[PDB]
Design a protein around this ligand. Structure first.
Ligand SMILES: *[C@@H]1O[C@H](CO)[C@@H](O)[C@H](O)[C@H]1NC(C)=O
Ligand code: NA
Lengths: 33, 117
């Protein structure tokens, strides 16, 4: 579930690169309780 | 779980020298470029964006031009090594390496620039 949240952060970071999304904040929040 | 690890979380580097800052990720047998993303960043400056083997110089931050590269020989061994040549005082700060290879993770590395005398 945590692994999937993190993969999705990368997905959205990539999507942004096509189309200011902070991938580190996103990854942080996947680990955040 | 997919984890990125740093052999060093602090590098103290001489002004005008060359530094290689390392970020490790698990590789089973041979590296697959089609599945790999490496992103090196420093306080919102984009240094390396390696997407499935593809790098675009146009999106490297102007402060790193002709000074920063991802070392490809290390990459084969699960080592995303960022080499910066002619280290500037402005190179001091917090670097982040994000690796996506199956899973995803990132680490912070502190670089301090000294001027020995
Ligand atoms: C850094 O790299 C350059 C070649 O890219 C080399 O000539 C130089 O000696 C290196 N600098 C130091 C201070 O070792
Ligand atoms: Na020195």
């Amino acid at each position: 579930s945590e692994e999937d949240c993190k993969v999705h952060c990368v997905k959205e970071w990539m999507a942004g690169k096509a189309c200011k999304f902070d991938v580190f904040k996103c990854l942080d929040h996947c680990a955040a309780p | 779980a997919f984890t990125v690890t740093v052999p060093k979380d602090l590098y103290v580097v001489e002004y005008g020298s060359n530094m290689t800052i390392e970020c490790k990720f698990p590789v089973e047998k041979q590296l697959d470029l089609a599945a790999l993303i490496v992103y090196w960043e420093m306080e919102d400056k984009n240094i390396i964006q390696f997407v499935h083997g593809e790098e675009d110089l146009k999106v490297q931050h102007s402060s790193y031009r002709q000074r920063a590269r991802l070392l490809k020989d290390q990459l084969s061994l699960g080592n995303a090594a960022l080499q910066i040549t002619d280290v500037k005082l402005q190179d001091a700060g917090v670097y982040r390496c994000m690796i996506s290879y199956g899973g995803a993770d990132y680490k912070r590395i502190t670089v301090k620039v000294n001027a020995p005398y």
